[PDB]
Design a protein around this ligand. Structure first.
Ligand SMILES: N[C@@H](CCCC[NH3+])C(=O)O
Ligand SMILES: N[C@@H](CCCC[NH3+])C(=O)O
Ligand SMILES: N[C@@H](CC(=O)O)C(=O)O
Lengths: 438, 429
């Protein structure tokens, strides 16, 4: 039958109760064959986080001290869990071995990866599934990059040959056989990898929210869930940037046609958003997929006599922005003028020196600054390229009496970006949603 | 005190000189005059300034240039002859042949076009000839302080005066030619010095029009235009000619030598020009560009991805009009002719230094810039424009606005250019 592969995040394994939710989800569908765990999430704001505490042990070892006070809390964390779940195992055998390894000079990467490992070994028992260490099945190369062709070969050999298997998350083996952890991707990528390697049908990604929403729920009331979403589509929304699964995490799935379903461990019935492939997603005829804005931006408007004739005028301008840790969002231009739209935190403090260097090299006539802009990105495949689709957005914004301060449509076929006064941000986003939902 | 510039077309020949006289003594206040060298009479005709550079070229190869100079001297002696002016123009011409053949600079040569026309003007119009070299000065760049001193002394002390206008004296007293606004800058320079009330720029067109008459039948005339609009409407005309008058009150007034009754248009300061909320000032376009679509995984997290791309564009003779960018893509809008021949070399270079998942070339795009201060903070201006374009089935390939409050730029398929331009005008008229 179908081969679904599941990952559960920190919030899904914060304590014993969540684990019961995970067991529930797993034996509620026999096709949930493969399970990838994160390390226990914080259960309250001021709670300590395991992985961090692990690193800290390694710090004691670098510093030539015991870390017995620290490792108490770890074992304490993990013994309460396997106790409350009343599981037939001796977790100390695992903890005790980890402690030793660390104080006998284990790498940081080894140290911090044990949060996922321990959850792995617990879950294999608790869910009656074969435990398969990551270090056996995921491999890196000489530079430090993910060796694809090998890992999958191994996955097919070791993982798809099991009926039900747990596979810990956040790490694999380095070229030299020693434990290497991912730098970007967390337990999500390892989930994607496994799916790729097993040729899974679905990769369920279990979190604490029932998919993604069409808009910010603080702003719009009771906003629809995004039934379906392409990768390119999602990427556009990710940047602007709604709290959504990052590109880093899903590159292995992307090559093959493996759909991801974002799902909620605390409301499993709730259907997900279903992140499809570009050529695997259909195209709803003239419609919005999502609306995602970010506040706090400032434009640097640069009027210059025949700016259009001379070459390298702009090249000089962002050679200067490269000279600091400051990226630009957009470079809207006119006939003999050009702007730079730049986020405020990215500009914080540095602003002043930058205006001077451009004045030296480029030699404009006017150089003003106008802050208090926000950006609203409205995204969808079906607006690519529908008639009057930007006009529909401007009609909306006209009805709410809100002055437009930037338009970009042209950067991307599935995306119109509108820039407006920061006061009007929430008003705009509202207006555009209503425009497309009855 | 009304200063006046006359362009080469307005001095192309004796008949045009007559027209100029008719204008000048139909207003006592037209007290000061700047001519250009004579424009071309027909399209095949030679152009005196260029002939002057050509003599300079013969001297650089140490060959005579009599054939060329015969053509210039003939050109000028005919004007005075036809005008029946009692002067000895050969006095002036012969001196010019000598200086040129005595290794004089190209700037000196080119200047003679308007110098010579100037001494002629003095007579026809009966005004005191004031060489620009003795009044407009440069440093070691324009010497604002020193020149204005000499203008009040030498010019302002005259009832009528003629100052030729494509040049002045350099630091070391040599002749120097404006690299920038021709005779239009002289007219402004004088206008400031001689603290004028109006500056008439006399062209062969009765001001500017809201849109191209080729495209919209009988377009309204642009009575008043701010400096900032004018620039932003450059697709239709100067900026480097206009600096000095900016800080002045002095309004420029573009006017028609062949139709002096026409009020023309009036280039105003931004603070002087009034703002009509919900109005356009003009619509202007240009129609052979190509967009280069470039796509990449995490384009924006790269180290100066765009910098690198237009660095590559910097190392060729390619100026671009717009750079749309976002998330995981970037576009370059480059004028077809500016791209001519260099295209495939450019594709590789960026394909080399960058990681492009994809590169496509979409040509056939024409830009339309609709402009006016009255679309400043006003709601619905975009919306008014684009409803117009929807109505008429014009597919929009790019919208760019954000560089200026008083300008939206649409990109349409070149076939829809006229249709679009017409539509926008109709929307606001
Ligand atoms: N042509 C300029 C940019 C002009 C932007 C405004 N039209 C360049 O290549 O740097
Ligand atoms: N700031 C980026 C460009 C981002 C434009 C949006 N994709 C760079 O340095 O090239
Ligand atoms: N044609 C002159 C300008 C002018 O006199 O209008 C030049 O050489 O720039």
């Amino acid at each position: 039958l179908k081969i679904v592969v599941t990952k559960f995040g920190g919030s899904s394994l914060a304590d014993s109760n969540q684990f019961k939710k995970v067991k529930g989800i797993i034996d509620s569908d026999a096709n949930r064959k493969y399970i990838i765990p994160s390390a226990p999430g914080k259960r309250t704001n001021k709670d300590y986080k395991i992985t961090d505490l692990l690193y800290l042990c390694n710090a004691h070892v670098k510093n030539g001290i015991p870390f017995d006070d620290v490792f108490k809390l770890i074992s304490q964390r993990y013994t309460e869990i396997v106790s409350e779940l009343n599981i037939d195992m001796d977790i100390a055998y695992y903890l005790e071995k980890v402690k030793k390894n660390i104080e006998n000079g284990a790498s940081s990467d080894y140290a911090a990866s044990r949060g996922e490992y321990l959850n792995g070994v617990i879950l294999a028992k608790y869910l009656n599934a074969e435990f398969i260490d990551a270090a056996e099945v995921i491999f890196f190369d000489k530079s430090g990059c993910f060796d694809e062709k090998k890992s999958y070969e191994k996955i097919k050999e070791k993982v798809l040959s099991c009926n039900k298997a747990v596979i810990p998350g956040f790490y694999g083996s380095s070229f030299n056989g020693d434990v290497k952890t991912f730098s970007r991707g967390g337990s999500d990528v390892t989930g994607s990898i496994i799916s790729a390697g097993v040729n899974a049908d679905l990769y369920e990604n279990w979190t604490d929210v029932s998919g993604f929403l069409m808009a910010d729920p603080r702003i719009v009331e009771n906003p629809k869930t995004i039934s379906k979403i392409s990768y390119k589509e999602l990427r556009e929304l990710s940047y602007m940037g709604a709290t959504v699964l990052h590109e880093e995490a899903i590159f292995p799935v992307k090559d093959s046609g493996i759909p991801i379903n974002i799902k909620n461990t605390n409301k499993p019935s709730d259907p997900g958003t279903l992140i499809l492939s570009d050529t695997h997603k259909e195209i709803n005829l003239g419609t919005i997929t999502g609306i995602a804005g970010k506040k706090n931006f400032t434009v640097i408007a640069i009027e210059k006599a025949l700016l259009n004739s001379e070459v390298g005028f702009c090249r000089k301008i962002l050679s200067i922005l490269e000279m600091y840790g400051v990226s630009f969002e957009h470079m809207p231009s006119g006939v003999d003028s050009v702007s730079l739209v730049i986020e405020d935190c990215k500009l914080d403090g540095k602003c002043d020196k930058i205006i001077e260097e451009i004045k030296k090299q480029c030699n404009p006539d006017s150089i003003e600054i106008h802050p208090n802009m926000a950006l609203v990105a409205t995204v969808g495949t079906g607006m690519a390229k529908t008639k009057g689709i930007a006009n529909k957005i401007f009609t909306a914004l006209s009805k709410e009496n809100v002055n437009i301060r930037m338009i970009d449509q042209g950067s991307s076929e599935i995306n119109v970006i509108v820039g407006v006064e920061t006061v009007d941000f929430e008003k705009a986003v509202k207006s555009i949603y209503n425009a497309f939902n009855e």
